[PDB]
Amino acid sequence: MKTAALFVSKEFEEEAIALVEGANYKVTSIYKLPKSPNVKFYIQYDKLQQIKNDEEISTLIIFEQLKPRHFINIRRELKGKEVLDKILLLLEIFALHAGSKEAKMQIELARLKYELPIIKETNNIPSIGIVGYTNSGKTSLFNSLTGLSPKRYAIPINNRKIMLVDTVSFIRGIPPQIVDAFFVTLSEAKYSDALILVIDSTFSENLLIETLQSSFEILREIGVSGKPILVTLNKIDKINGDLYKKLDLVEKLSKELYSPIFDVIPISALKRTNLELLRDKIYQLATQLSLEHHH
Template sequence: MRLGLAGGAAGKRALLLLPRGLESWELREAYALVDSAGYTVVDTVWYRRLSRSRLLSRAKLEEVARKAEQLRGDEDARIIVFDELRPREYFRIVKEARVETIDRTLLILEIFALHAGSKEAKYQIELARLKHRLPLVREAVRLAKMRELPGFLGPGGYAVDKYYKYMVSRIARIRRELERLRERRSVERAKRRSAGLPHVAIVGYASAGKTTLFNALTGAGKPVGSEYFTTISPKVKASLIGGRRVAFVDTVGFISRIPPEIIEAFHSTLEEAVRADLLLYVLDLSEPEHVVAEKLSEGLETLRRIGVVGVPMILVANKVDLVEEAERARLLSLVEAMTESVYPSLVGAVAVSAARGWGVGELRCRIATLLSGMDGSTC
């Protein structure tokens, strides 16, 4: 799969390990996440979990090692296990395949890092990463003491032990920094708004088509003043909409089953949505109706939890090219009614195909009208 500009630079190669039994929307999400983190999948291994702590059989492990051969020696390459990886299983894989390995949580944290705008979000992510790696390093200390891990993370047990202590003190330090930042939060926020442009944040679940829409909305016009925005976040781009400069933000979006230990990092990465003048809520209308409904209500609940209230929102029903023409209107009014009942600041719903450009003109027009404070009648 290939994506456009903001989908992350291709080049980091990955071997993807997927547990059997994923539903098709979960599979699409998995690929969207891998892509959002900037990886290109070179091969895939499907496995059936043996247990929660042991994922791969001996034969599977050998298959992984074989397929990982092409990645050996490439420092950017990763084995991505789309699952929860316990320390022992991690070392089993790394020892056998000799390629750095990450699990679903670390993959998600890499995506957060690409989107992190504020210092607070960056600290939250580092904290989550450190906490996630701590058990791993503890296991490394154990293995080094048993001399089962010569040379890994430095020469023997002493270095690993030192690294473990460093992590613990770094965690304490970040916690203190976060306390301090929370007190200053409002000041920071006021400063960041100083660019003065209206901000339009694109939210929605992974693989709904946020980045495709972001590209469609910002790619057409010549980006203006993008240098300024890249210093805030690489996912912000200014574009001319109805003769006026508007900053579009491709947010990290929602991800199903966010591991509880990274929920704070998730919320602080999503904070662009809180500050936006307008929200575009993108959903994939081609998914089964119950999936669309479930994700919509969970997404709206997440917005409520991070404190998004009263921000005008346009519902963008995407991928209508995959929906029967006769079904489009019915599904659109269904999701519109669902949203309105829990989010009173909904100001409209537009059916689009971001990939084909259908409805994007109408959407631009709605955005322009809304931001200039007129009623929608001009579109």
């Protein structure tokens, strides 16, 4: 697919790669943010030229907020290759998930508001949304259940077909200019019949409680209620320690935070561990959703 060069600090690197790849980009080269950002192109002129003359790179992505000055200078150099900062990247990601008119419009509106200053200076299918943070590994889970990219994909489980919805992952510290765009795009998860809350188990005890609590809090804000939630404690193969300690916590805490909670199972999307068990739980959930209003 389309390749991209990524400029990002070591702290946001992991998240950046996840977001970029979520935008259907293959990260070929990675660089850290400039100590003293170039006043001209934000990045070294010699590096911009290298990327400019590298046919193996189609898009330049910088995980920071660029000034209108930088966009104009960089774009008038790339010729055809696109350039994206954090804000444009996120808006581009939202558009991929956006299904409703309001989301699509909020995204486009915010996009035009961000480009303006730059141009002025020149039979019965249930829906199962997969929610969670960017670091939860929810994307890997979607790709495993699907077999993989589409944000909506139907999968056969026995005699039932389930519509898996890869919703926009929760994002911490979002630019104020795109808050409304993200809120509406994320709120689209309220229209799902059920949800799969992916939880990063690698977190420490307190941080894990914070991620779980925050996840349900966010789901509460977007207007989710009455929807059966199947919690999946992801990243168990990376635990390298005690699983029951965190699993019990998640299970015992989830029931206190939200209702109804369908189930709470441990998984490992990459190693495809317990995924067979997961499919079984999905089927049982889909079976339940159909009988919910039957007589």
